[PDB]
Each structure stands twice: as structure tokens, then as C-alpha cells.
Design a protein around this ligand. Structure first.
Ligand SMILES: CCCCCCCCCCCC(=O)O
Length: 389
């Protein structure tokens, strides 16, 4: 059951209030990842507060549960900041004071919800993480001057673009790792993400898992550091889907893995290492397609997007997709060291000239926010903008 019914009522009845931290990109340019924050206000100038309750598992990572909708909170942030900036890329969190870390706000659903997708729940790695490893690392990994507030990019990741296009709240369980290295590998596992999603949603009011759109992508971390073999990663992926569908999940956005060996990171790897990872990716992608077919045959709503085929096109012919460069990071990083994520980096001259929206890669591994937007747009086109869901 994860949390007893008694524990749930006791936590839900422990009613209180908290404040809202409104984050925003300080520059009008997506070349600058730097952010700042302001407390949300009401139109009369008074502090905006939200009512609800706190809950943390043995993780001690506190989530605030409110009846106030994500749209109302976003609206308060937008009006408070009054930034005539198209690239403000506003995000928000619960915080009692300046000492507080960035707590996720869960907006409780109404008892009478229509049978329709009303939220996005993301699971995965640094292709989806919006702040979990950042929060875990105490706002250090990745550096907030060169990576957009805990996202491994210069802005929003594909899940945020998918959720925004559909005007849906996004709740993130994805956790960034370290490409080609062993840092955080016992903490980033999809098993722990599914367990966490199953524990925290038990505290939500009127939660109907049938109304959640689940996104899932992982396996590249394990293939890059040799932590889990192809069959071990296939088993982990199959387990995540078994556990989620057994817990009432009905809707999934699945994707094949892009060939990470096409990223700037692998300029510094040996050909032997590259061919090994490429082969694991190809093997995993056939399994992902088989899993999508398996759940579709059982009557689940599955949208499978071939991200692998898209990144093959993006890296071989960037000019056909609106990019000038798919071979270098936009940031002036010329090695593959996890240590670089702790520091500030200038843009390399070619990226300063063209703008970050014309580069496929932000750093040696991760796509820029323009690439994330393109992937989101291509996925939304393949799924005919909520067709099966
Ligand atoms: C060709 C583009 C490839 C994009 C690779 C994205 C990085 C995958 C995530 C692996 C690191 C991690 O987050 O644990």
C-alpha cells in the first residue's frame, strides 16, 4: 500500500500554508541560463499563500499538496514578475522562507474529474530531469549559471514543452546522472522513481492514475558506464511498466533511445567504447518497440516516438531541421568530465554568433532547449496532439 490509510488522513488533515518562489530567466536570450526568483504576490501587493499539507517519505524530500491549481499559481507568478520577456521560462515552488529548498507543489484533483488526461508524470534521466538531482546536490549539480535551474540544458526539457502545449501540470520523478561515470548511479534508478511516484501519489486527494499521462525514457546512463547490461536494462524497463500498469496507469508516451555516441561527449571516447554503446542502444530500441506493442495489444494508450531516428537525422543533416551545428556543444566545453557541471562556462564563438537555438547540443551530452522543443513538437505530431489519449 506504500502509506497506510491512517497515515494518509493524519498527513492530509495537518493543514497549514506556505509561500511561492517564482523563478525566471534573467536574460531575454536563451544563450544565458542564469535565473533569479521573487515571492508570488496577489494584485493588491499582499504575499500570495497556498493552503495545504506537507508530506515526505523516508527520503525526507517534502512535497506540498494544495487545492490551488497549477494554472492559478503560474498566473500569480506571471503577474508578480510582469516580465515582458518571451523567454522568462517561469517555474515555481513552495517555500516557507529564503532558507527553504525548492519544494514541488502537487495540485490535488477534484473528486469529479472528467475521464481525460489532466497531468503529466515524467520518469527517466537527464533528458527529462527538471530539478531532482539539482535539489539532491544542494543547488550545485548542474551549476545554475550555465545550466537552466537544475535542468541539463539552457532551458525547458521536452516533457515541459509537451505539458505546456497541452496546458497540463507536469510532475517530475526523472533524475539526472553523470554520462559515462558512476556518480549517483545507485540513486537515479527507474525502480526508485516508480517507488517514489507510488508513495507520494498515495498522499494526493482524488488521485485517479487513469488520468495521468506517463512519460518514460532511460537506459543511456547504464549503457554509458556499464552499470547494468542490456538484459538488466530491458528487465528494469519491463518492471517499471508492470508496476505502473498494475497501479492503474493507462496512458504512456514512450520513446526509443537516441544514439548518445553521436553527442560531442564521444569525441573523447575510443571507437571500441562507441561501437559497444551503439550496439546496446540498437538492442534496447527493438525491446522498447516490442514493449510498446505488448501494452498496446492489452488495450493501453501507447504513443511510441522514434527519438533514435530523429537524432540520426538531426546529427547527419542539422541544416534540414533548422540547426547550424550538431557536432559541438554550444558551451565552450572540450572534454567529457562530470567536474565541468560544477562551474560556469562561456559559449564557444560559433554558438555566440549563431545563438543557442541553432545548436543541437548545449553541453557535451545534453540537447539545447531548441532541440528539446523540436523533439516535443515531433512527438506531439506523431501522437496527433492527444489522439490515443
Ligand atoms: C544524440 C543525442 C543523445 C542525447 C543523450 C542524452 C543523455 C542521456 C542521459 C544519460 C545521463 C544520465 O542522465 O544519467
Amino acid at each position: 500500500a506504500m502509506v497506510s490509510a491512517a497515515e494518509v488522513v493524519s498527513a492530509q488533515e495537518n493543514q497549514t500554508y506556505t509561500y511561492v518562489r517564482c523563478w525566471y530567466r534573467t536574460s531575454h536570450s536563451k544563450d544565458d541560463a542564469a535565473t533569479d526568483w521573487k515571492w508570488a504576490k496577489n494584485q493588491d501587493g499582499s504575499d500570495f499563500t497556498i493552503d495545504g499539507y506537507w508530506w515526505s517519505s523516508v527520503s525526507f524530500k517534502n512535497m506540498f499538496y494544495t487545492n490551488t491549481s497549477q494554472n492559478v499559481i503560474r498566473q500569480r507568478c506571471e503577474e508578480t514578475l510582469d516580465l515582458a520577456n518571451e523567454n522568462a521560462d517561469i517555474t515555481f515552488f513552495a517555500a516557507d522562507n529564503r532558507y527553504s529548498y525548492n519544494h514541488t507543489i502537487w495540485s490535488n484533483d477534484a473528486a469529479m474529474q472528467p475521464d481525460q488526461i489532466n497531468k503529466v508524470v515524467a520518469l527517466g534521466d537527464s533528458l527529462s530531469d527538471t530539478g531532482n538531482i539539482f535539489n539532491a546536490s544542494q543547488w550545485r549539480f548542474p551549476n545554475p549559471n550555465s545550466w537552466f535551474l537544475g535542468h541539463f540544458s539552457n532551458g525547458f526539457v521536452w516533457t515541459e514543452y509537451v505539458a505546456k502545449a497541452k496546458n497540463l501540470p507536469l510532475y517530475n520523478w526523472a533524475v539526472g546522472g553523470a554520462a559515462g561515470e558512476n556518480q549517483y548511479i545507485a540513486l537515479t534508478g527507474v525502480g526508485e522513481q516508480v517507488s517514489s511516484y507510488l508513495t507520494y501519489t498515495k498522499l494526493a486527494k482524488n488521485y485517479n492514475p487513469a488520468n495521468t499521462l506517463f512519460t518514460l525514457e532511460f537506459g543511456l546512463n547504464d549503457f554509458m558506464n556499464y552499470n547494468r547490461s542490456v538484459p538488466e536494462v530491458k528487465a528494469d524497463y519491463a518492471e517499471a511498466l508492470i508496476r505502473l500498469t498494475d497501479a492503474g496507469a493507462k496512458n504512456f508516451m514512450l520513446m526509443t533511445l537516441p544514439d548518445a555516441t553521436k553527442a560531442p561527449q564521444f569525441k573523447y571516447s575510443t571507437q571500441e567504447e562507441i561501437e559497444t554503446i551503439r550496439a546496446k542502444v540498437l538492442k534496447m530500441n527493438e525491446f522498447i518497440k516490442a514493449q510498446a506493442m505488448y501494452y498496446k495489444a492489452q488495450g493501453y494508450n501507447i504513443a511510441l516516438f522514434d527519438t533514435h531516428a530523429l537524432f540520426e537525422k538531426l546529427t547527419s543533416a542539422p541544416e534540414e531541421h533548422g540547426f547550424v551545428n550538431a557536432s559541438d556543444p554550444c558551451l565552450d566545453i572540450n572534454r567529457s568530465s562530470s567536474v565541468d557541471y560544477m562551474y560556469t562556462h562561456s559559449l564557444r564563438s560559433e554558438c555566440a554568433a549563431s545563438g543557442a537555438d541553432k545548436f543541437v547540443f548545449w553541453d557535451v551530452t545534453h540537447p539545447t532547449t531548441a532541440t528539446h522543443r523540436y523533439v516535443a513538437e515531433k512527438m506531439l505530431e506523431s501522437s496527433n496532439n492527444l489522439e490515443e489519449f
